[PDB]
Amino acid sequence: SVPSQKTYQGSYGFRLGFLHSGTAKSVTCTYSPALNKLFCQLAKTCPVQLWVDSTPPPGTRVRAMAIYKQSQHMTEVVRRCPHHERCSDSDGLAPPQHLIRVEGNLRAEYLDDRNTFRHSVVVPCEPPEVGSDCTTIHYNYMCYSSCMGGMNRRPILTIITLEDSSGNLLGRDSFEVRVCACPGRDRRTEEENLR
Ligand SMILES: Oc1c(Br)cc(Cl)cc1CN1CCC(N2CCC(O)CC2)CC1
Numbered sequence: 231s232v233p234s235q236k237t238y239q240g241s242y243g244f245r246l247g248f249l250h251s252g253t254a255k256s257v258t259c260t261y262s263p264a265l266n267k268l269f270c271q272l273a274k275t276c277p278v279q280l281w282v283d284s285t286p287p288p289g290t291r292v293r294a295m296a297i298y299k300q301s302q303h304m305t306e307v308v309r310r311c312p313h314h315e316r317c318s319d320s321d322g323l324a325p326p327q328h329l330i331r332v333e334g335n336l337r338a339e340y341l342d343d344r345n346t347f348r349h350s351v352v353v354p355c356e357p358p359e360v361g362s363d364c365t366t367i368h369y370n371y372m373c374y375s376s377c378m379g380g381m382n383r384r385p386i387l388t389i390i391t392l393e394d395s396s397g398n399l400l401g402r403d404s405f406e407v408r409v410c411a412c413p414g415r416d417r418r419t420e421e422e423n424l425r
């Protein structure tokens with residue numbers, strides 16, 4: 231099966247936000263609103279903001295999952311390639327097979343779905359730090375889009391879902407991801423192609 235990617239703000243007015251990091255050749259993570267697409271280097275910090283209109287209940291969680299964007303591939307599980315799944319770069323919590331990690335959150339949980347076999351990482355939904363208006367999760371993507379035997383140049387989407395303590399849907403958002411050597415250059419290129 232294919233998880234839904236339908237944008238759904240739900241009762242709490244849930245949606246994502248991204249920083250404005252620009253497109254300098256040195257940039258390591260940058261988001262394109264025109265493409266709804268995040269461009270990042272391998273295993274680098276990707277700040278993703280969580281915005282809500284009202285506070286969700288205690289026990290609310292935030293799950294991240296990757297799927298292939300193209301329908302002929304949508305049904306295939308997104309996972310790390312045969313090289314990276316064996317390079318012993320574990321953080322002690324993430325299974326070596328998982329493409330998406332949450333950085334610096336000891337309460338992160340990693341799921342191998344016993345039915346779909348799809349991977350996800352989920353964390354408690356926390357309130358913003360005092361003085362802030364949103365909450366930020368830091369993600370890492372642990373393979374290149376180009377990795378052979380893995381994503382193999384196929385575009386993926388990340389689906390972020392807001393869930394209750396049972397795992398029921400409260401909210402959903404999504405964005406395309408390209409993990410590449412030069413995010414700044416590739417964003418500039420793909421935005422120019424769109425134009
Ligand atoms: O922002 C989060 C996040 Br993200 C996660 C969690 Cl668990 C809790 C909060 C607390 N927020 C809730 C929404 C509050 N504003 C009410 C007025 C409206 O005009 C703007 C939104 C601000 C405080």
Ligand SMILES: [Zn+2]
Nearest residue numbers: 311314373377
């Ligand atoms: Zn790889």
